[PDB]
Design a protein around this ligand. Structure first.
Ligand SMILES: Nc1ncnc2c1ncn2[C@@H]1O[C@H](COP(=O)(O)OP(=O)(O)CP(=O)(O)O)[C@@H](O)[C@H]1O
Ligand SMILES: Nc1ncnc2c1ncn2[C@@H]1O[C@H](COP(=O)(O)OP(=O)(O)CP(=O)(O)O)[C@@H](O)[C@H]1O
Ligand SMILES: Nc1ncnc2c1ncn2[C@@H]1O[C@H](COP(=O)(O)OP(=O)(O)CP(=O)(O)O)[C@@H](O)[C@H]1O
Ligand SMILES: Nc1ncnc2c1ncn2[C@@H]1O[C@H](COP(=O)(O)OP(=O)(O)CP(=O)(O)O)[C@@H](O)[C@H]1O
Ligand SMILES: [Mg+2]
Ligand SMILES: [Mg+2]
Ligand SMILES: [Mg+2]
Ligand SMILES: [Mg+2]
Ligand SMILES: [Mg+2]
Ligand SMILES: [Mg+2]
Lengths: 869, 4, 349, 176, 4
């Protein structure tokens, strides 16, 4: 079994709208395609003994073991590779269950689609499933060590990409509130929202956290100075640069009950909390002396409380207690630790509420000061601490005390955060009773921490959990404000670029910043950001991440959807212009019914409060109306369309072309926007396909809330001139003569141009070309189209690329054109440089020459040599 | 430094 | 503008305004400057990554951790005309701006190697321009030129320095517009690369630089070019400040012509600086001075808003405390936060 | 707190006094079966519809003889709640909980027993419920619990000794 | 660092 191709999808797609995270593997069954399990001895018992868990898979049978009801009756490795990749992810804790198998290409090549949680782990599991499955159809088993090492690699891949818990807390609430989010390419930042409404976070810091506040909070001497100048209670203490002055300092501080810290900040080490004697002060002095030259602070009694303030408002309070054991009967400390360290709520690292108690030389040092060691028996109800400070990660506890805090203490905490200029802050308070004023209990504020963690408030060991994230998202996205900008997505086989430029032009008349992407470039307010084919999800992301954009208009192509899914998840307006038989055979899509399923992806991602805009004159597009959860609007070139009539009779909205006007039907009322002949993109009303593109743009602007007068201004000033939209209806005026340069692909574009030509009430209709060598067997169809549209047909199909042989393409065109109307001077000249595209003097006054060049750049260069008007 |  | 100000007791901060309308500044940082933006701006690799992902032109270059791979790196970068910097940031030292040959790349390599393990960047031609953006809006543009002497007749460099260093507009430290030209072994190293030394005579109109980089404090000049910047370049500069999240920002641009679009002159954005200085814009050596502060105070105290809270002062020989408590009580009935002082205590609500 | 009219003021004629009043910002209306059966509802649609219980009272009057019919009268309120609004149902009442399948609006539930399969199935899909638990009246919003107060400290309930007053308090808290 |  060989893997030929792998795609990773990230967004709504062909296989599923909801299952955004999928891996599509193109698997070539060189073997096994002819051996449906019963032809592979031992491949039932081998598969189940290697992976005993593969009973939870259901398939066509809606049963536990439904997968295993088969396997022995094979599926030609469909299902088997698919279910193994899903199970290998489940075995390491990554849950995924969706999957599908479909045959493509030549017999034996399959598309295996499965769900992933982590992108690299997902691809890894796919490759591993193939190796496991291949060994078992060769031999009858799979070595245990070749399974254990793969599971270890999946566990590491799924760990390396994990978000920390403070980010997960904010992100989870953001999803509940429907706020879109993205990871950014630098410094572990996360973006929330689109365009002008975006915000950034990084763990517990945000776009609202100022630098002056954060730096002050990290300066202990600075913080203390600022707070005591505001009348806020802080510990009393001094500065001694390792001189033996401690015996005098206590006279200013308040006697011996003091705290001695290393003067600098280098972890919680070398700290004595309660000094009572001269020699103890010296032992603390000698340890303090290790760090650069917070000494002799008065010692205060009480518990360590953590107070969380988010926007100048109190959110949560927790009491923190260090790891300990108690005199739970006449047992020793080592016995007590083993007794309580078995508590089921104590689990490793960030895994369970509490963690394990670990003893080391530092725990012993703490125990010795209390008069105990590991073999000592504690008196009934005696409490012995194994740590000097409280921390959940070291085995301590956290108790929710949020509802027990006194109103005056609430007022003081909020004032502290405002004085030090921090939005999200942790405040460390020492007090014996949080329910009484700090001035009565003689409590103090010890520390102010910028960007505090949340584990103790969202997963306390006692009391109720608090939703800490909700107050954070409320300051970033205040009630009543948007987190998104409008998105207008345009798709269909033909007309996308033209429709996209017009719609962006109309929105722009409102004075807003409009960003858009097309196959030519990425633009913002007429400035070009990037050039080239900019369709697809990577370009959509440039506009959505841009801090200045208010409106996004995006043309959407099938290559983008099939290769990686949509970039935006949902939109306000989804426009489907047409479905036609182009690009068949590519991307595993062979039929028109399948092509319709790709285009329908846009209609199905429109938000229920938004609209889908459908073409009522197109049988595959109109039919999409029965899948759409959104409102539906229709457009047509014929008011007498039963769909339109049935729809407006139920008070729907439609856009039609009638009486020379482009108008909107809103229930019983008719709104005329303008006359087709006065809108410059349409050649005096002679280009029906340009009229249809204009109707779609007008209707999308209308249903999304723009006024009619704005729409009129937009259509009247819009241009598609040569050198703005080269190769797209460029009509050149050369005295009493015209030439048209265009660039059709699929047959619909040849018919659309042919109708323009039919309306040309001039003289001869000449055509100087046909298809290149990379088309399928549609050369005859082109010849049939030219035969009834032109009276001068000359063939040049011997281009420079010569994808296949020489002049055979021209020979097939000649066969086709002579099939329908063998009376149009059917010359074949083959050359198309300055030979046929220069021979314009063979056409009389007011005739029209239609050019279908391989290269537009040359066609519009040569036509200028004739000095056009 | 994070989670202070 | 009549905005009251005070010095604060910590970290050299200054307070502007009273009560609920107060703002703080520290040099060129303010209460509106976010930490995520300032930290990103100090990360050169991070800044470059974010800007090129937004479609913004930046220099092309690579990462070599002092391996002799320079001879291959130039194939990805664009040949020998490259810039080699020490990989870390430890002052403007060990930097070669225009490498043309293999052995030069090695001399630069050996110097770069002094710092912790920004190498082989393509070299771009043009002048060094500083653009100042304050609230997502352009305020000033200045062209920066390094200390130099020119072929002002058939005189030597030491003679030319003495001739031009007597200019009355050249005064010590932050005292006069321009400062003095000082030569040391580093000036000599710069002059030797140009083919000159202190006793050499320069050809008429020849320009010899005494420094590799521009700085007014080292004897260079600054020319105001604020009114010569093209509308598209204005748009791009404002977009850069918004992408990197900084309110007050300096942007370093290399271009031959600030009056043409950067895409036509092949210019690049080299650096984004949080909290830039102002001397070059408020005291330029050529062109007109700009009032840089006015746009800063306008974002801190937007037009139409107060910078002060009401103050009611009560004095007299008898009755002050009683009058003060009653007046505070009356204001309090409007639901506002009222602070007051008396001979008994200081109160808030 | 000013009295406009005294006496039995339920029914559509009284609802119209409040709705036509130029000063009113919020309308809270008790709705009786006599009003609905005699003339229909006065307002067409509403934001919150609360159904507290169905019981065998007033049977034989107004052409309603059975409990199944009485349930169809009470369900009129649940069915006029705007799709953007909520219906508040009693999960401990088999006829009321069943109305949830007719409602076009969102559904919230209340109960006197947290171990009610309806409540559990509902919060697991991120719905909202109000329950009485551990002496507290609390709101379950998805996975989070919000405690409002203790039953014994709320004066309408006789020190926590009147289960029917607790249930009435849960319905009012959930609607707000 | 200041005045960058
Ligand atoms: N003056 C004082 N009186 C009483 N207890 C004090 C105290 N100063 C500090 N403590 C106690 O010591 C605890 C932690 O010590 P300290 O504040 O010196 O550590 P630290 O600032 O390095 C933070 P961390 O320990 O998390 O790294 C405080 O939460 C408080 O309980
Ligand atoms: N309904 C339709 N609307 C517009 N153009 C149509 C059309 N049917 C055929 N055409 C032809 O299609 C040509 C291509 O138009 P345009 O460039 O706007 O389309 P498109 O962007 O969908 C093609 P691509 O796949 O290259 O992105 C037009 O010049 C026109 O001749
Ligand atoms: N790729 C490049 N091409 C051309 N010139 C460049 C360049 N990279 C840097 N320079 C020039 O070098 C000058 C300063 O060099 P560089 O940016 O490496 O210094 P630096 O970042 O350490 C700031 P400072 O010199 O003020 O400390 C820039 O202003 C620019 O003129
Ligand atoms: N015009 C006046 N208004 C109020 N009190 C007056 C007074 N003339 C005399 N007194 C007396 O003055 C006493 C002191 O009043 P109060 O304490 O309000 O004044 P004061 O604050 O101006 C004095 P200090 O100098 O101590 O601040 C009152 O108790 C009253 O007996
Ligand atoms: Mg601490
Ligand atoms: Mg196409
Ligand atoms: Mg296109
Ligand atoms: Mg610089
Ligand atoms: Mg006095
Ligand atoms: Mg007094």
């Amino acid at each position: 079994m060989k893997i030929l191709k792998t795609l990773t999808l990230r967004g709504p797609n062909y296989w599923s709208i909801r299952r955004k995270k999928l891996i599509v593997m193109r698997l070539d069954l060189e073997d096994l395609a002819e051996r449906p399990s019963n032809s592979i001895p031992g491949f039932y018992e081998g598969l189940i003994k290697v992976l005993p868990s593969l009973v939870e898979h259901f398939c066509s049978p809606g049963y536990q073991g439904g997968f295993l009801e088969r396997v022995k009756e094979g599926t030609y490795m469909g299902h088997i590779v698919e279910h193994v990749a899903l199970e290998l992810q489940e075995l390491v804790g990554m849950t995924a269950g969706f999957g599908r198998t479909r045959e493509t290409s030549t017999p034996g090549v399959y598309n295996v689609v499965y769900e992933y949680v982590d992108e690299q782990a997902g691809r890894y599991a796919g490759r591993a499933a193939v190796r496991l499955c291949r060994s078992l159809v060769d031999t009858g088993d799979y070595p245990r060590l070749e399974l254990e090492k793969d599971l270890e690699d999946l566990r590491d891949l799924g760990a390396n990409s994990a978000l920390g818990p403070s980010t997960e807390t904010i992100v989870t609430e953001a999803e509940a509130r429907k706020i879109p989010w993205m990871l950014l390419s630098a410094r572990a930042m996360v973006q929330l929202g689109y365009g002008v409404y975006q915000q950034r976070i990084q763990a517990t810091l945000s776009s609202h956290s100022g630098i002056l506040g954060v730096e002050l909070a990290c300066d202990k001497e600075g913080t203390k100075t600022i707070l005591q100048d505001a009348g806020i209670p802080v510990p009393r203490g001094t500065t001694i640069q390792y001189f033996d002055d401690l015996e005098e300092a206590i006279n200013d501080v308040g006697g011996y009950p003091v705290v001695i810290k290393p003067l600098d900040g280098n972890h919680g080490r070398g700290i004595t909390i309660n000094v009572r004697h001269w020699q103890e002060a010296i032992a603390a002095y000698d340890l303090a002396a290790e760090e650069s030259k917070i000494i002799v602070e008065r010692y205060y009694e009480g518990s360590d409380h953590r107070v969380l303030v988010v926007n100048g408002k109190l959110v949560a309070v927790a009491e923190r207690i260090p790891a300990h054991v108690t005199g739970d009967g006449s047992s020793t400390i080592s016995e007590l630790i083993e007794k309580t360290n078995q508590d089921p709520n104590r689990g490793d690292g960030h895994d369970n509420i509490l963690t394990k108690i670990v003893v080391n030389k530092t725990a012993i040092d703490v125990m010795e000061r209390q008069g105990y060691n590991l073999d000592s028996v504690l008196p009934k109800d005696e409490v012995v601490y194994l740590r000097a400070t409280a921390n959940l990660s070291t085995g301590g506890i956290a108790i929710d005390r949020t509802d027990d805090i006194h109103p005056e203490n609430i007022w003081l905490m909020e004032r502290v955060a405002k004085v030090i200029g921090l939005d999200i802050a942790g405040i460390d308070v020492v007090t014996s009773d949080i329910s009484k004023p700090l001035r009565e209990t003689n409590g103090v504020i010890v520390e102010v921490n910028a960007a505090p963690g949340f584990r103790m408030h969202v997963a306390p060991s006692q009391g109720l959990p608090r939703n800490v994230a909700a107050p954070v998202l409320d300051m970033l996205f205040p009630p009543g404000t948007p987190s998104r900008i409008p998105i207008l997505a345009v798709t269909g086989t033909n007309g996308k670029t033209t429709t996209t430029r017009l719609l962006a032009h109309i929105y722009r008349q409102t004075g807003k910043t409009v960003g858009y992407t097309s196959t030519d470039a990425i633009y913002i307010n007429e400035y070009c950001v990037e050039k080239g084919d900019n369709t697809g999800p990577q370009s959509a992301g440039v506009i959505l991440r841009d801090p200045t954009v208010e409106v996004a208009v995006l043309e959407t192509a099938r290559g983008g959807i099939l290769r990686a899914g949509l970039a935006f998840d949902s939109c306000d307006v989804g426009v489907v212009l047409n479905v036609a038989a182009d690009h068949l055979g590519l991307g595993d899509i062979d039929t028109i019914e399948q092509m319709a399923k790709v285009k329908s992806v846009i209609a199905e991602v429109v938000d229920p409060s938004g609209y889908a805009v459908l073409n009522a004159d197109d049988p595959l597009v109109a039919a999409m109306a029965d899948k759409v959860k959104a409102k539906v609007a229709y457009f047509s070139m014929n008011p007498d369309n039963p769909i339109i009539q049935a729809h407006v009779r139920r008070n729907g909205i439609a856009a039609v072309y009638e009486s020379g006007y482009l108008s909107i039907l809103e229930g019983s009322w008719t709104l005329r926007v303008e006359q087709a002949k006065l809108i410059p993109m349409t050649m005096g009303g002679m280009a029906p396909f340009m009229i249809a593109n204009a109707l779609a743009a007008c209707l999308a602007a209308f249903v999304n809330g723009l006024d009619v007068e704005v729409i009129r201004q937009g259509v009247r000033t819009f241009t598609t001139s040569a050198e703005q939209t080269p190769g797209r209806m460029n009509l050149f005026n050369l005295g009493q003569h015209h030439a048209l340069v265009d660039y059709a692909h699929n047959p619909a574009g040849y018919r659309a141009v042919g109708d323009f030509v039919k309306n040309w009430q001039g003289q001869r209709f000449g055509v100087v070309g046909g298809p290149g060598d990379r088309r399928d067997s549609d050369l005859i169809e082109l010849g049939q189209i030219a035969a009834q549209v032109f009276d001068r047909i000359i063939v040049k199909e011997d281009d420079d690329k010569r994808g296949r042989s020489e002049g055979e393409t021209a020979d097939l065109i000649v066969k086709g054109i002579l099939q329908e109307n063998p009376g149009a001077s059917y010359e074949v000249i083959l050359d198309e440089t300055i030979a046929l595209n220069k021979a314009l003097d063979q056409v009389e006054e007011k005739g029209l020459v239609v050019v279908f060049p391989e290269s537009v750049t040359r066609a519009i260069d040569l036509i200028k040599v004739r000095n056009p008007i | 430094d994070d989670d202070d």
